[PDB]
Amino acid sequence: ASGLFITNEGNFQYSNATLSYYDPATCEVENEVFYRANGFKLGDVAQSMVIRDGIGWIVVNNSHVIFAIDINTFKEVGRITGFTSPRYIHFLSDEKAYVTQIWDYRIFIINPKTYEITGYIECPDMDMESGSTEQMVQYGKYVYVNCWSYQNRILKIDTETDKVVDELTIGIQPTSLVMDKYNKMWTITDGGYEGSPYGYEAPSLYRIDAETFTVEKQFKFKLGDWPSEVQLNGTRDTLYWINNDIWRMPVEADRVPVRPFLEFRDTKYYGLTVNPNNGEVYVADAIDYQQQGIVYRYSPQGKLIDEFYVGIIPGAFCWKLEHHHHH
Ligand SMILES: [Cl-]
């Protein structure tokens, strides 16, 4: 049956990260599913998750590892260690995938089938001290990736050579990256922070053409905002993101709407996702980064459907959609 995974960062150096699994049909959530199925802790700061042919890959940022589990039993089928500080994983094939990192100038290349690191992609003009590669989107034989922490550019990678072939400098610290149905990528910066050794400025939302790798639209916000998590709906024509409130806009719009999708409620909207089949929007609220977090489920029209408590600091989602795998 269809379901939704929710990773929970937990607290840094507290090794209290956990995995939750929610059933939209029953409105029931199960917490600490990884530990309950495996007998050992997920780790420190679970960061993201992807599902590929009956296998879920969970990135645990501060545990230097990626866990491969059965999406039904949640039991571990394999794992890859040795990562500096893993962020996201993007599959190119059953034997090749990229794993971005923070505190590293290299993008780790791995072989999912053998569960080992096979190589590295060196990013130009960055080191280990402040290096950072985050989310990735694929465009034909190319893969685009945003450089977040103490960085200000998007890199273009040729998957046929595993090398960076181009770059684009934009606002400081782009946080995420998605591709719409017009082959236009979207990224939103967080503008750094006050007293930052790198910079502090008003953040912006960018619309960049994938083919020409050029900025087409730039929507600048207010100084002090720390936006993040650009997300798209199933048809990839409605963009959502976080900036105090949960915002949304048609990808063809010439301006950001004056009203948000979900108003700020003095808490801490941290994670976000949209059901690719029905458009329902799920918002992960960290509350205060201390107590147990909560997830809100809204209809496309913005009606509250359900809410459920998960783990500490829920920040990422992964949909488990039913479908027949190829043989
Ligand atoms: Cl768990």
PDB file of C-alpha atoms and ligand atoms in Angstrom, residues 18-19 32-35, ligand 1:
ATOM      1  CA  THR A  18      14.620   8.564  13.710  1.00  0.00           C
ATOM      2  CA  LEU A  19      12.476   7.384  10.829  1.00  0.00           C
ATOM      3  CA  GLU A  32      11.196   4.869  15.252  1.00  0.00           C
ATOM      4  CA  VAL A  33      10.474   2.325  12.500  1.00  0.00           C
ATOM      5  CA  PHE A  34      14.121   1.869  11.566  1.00  0.00           C
ATOM      6  CA  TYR A  35      15.153   1.026  15.116  1.00  0.00           C
TER       7      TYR A  35
HETATM    8 CL    CL B   1      14.114   4.904  13.816  1.00  0.00          CL
END
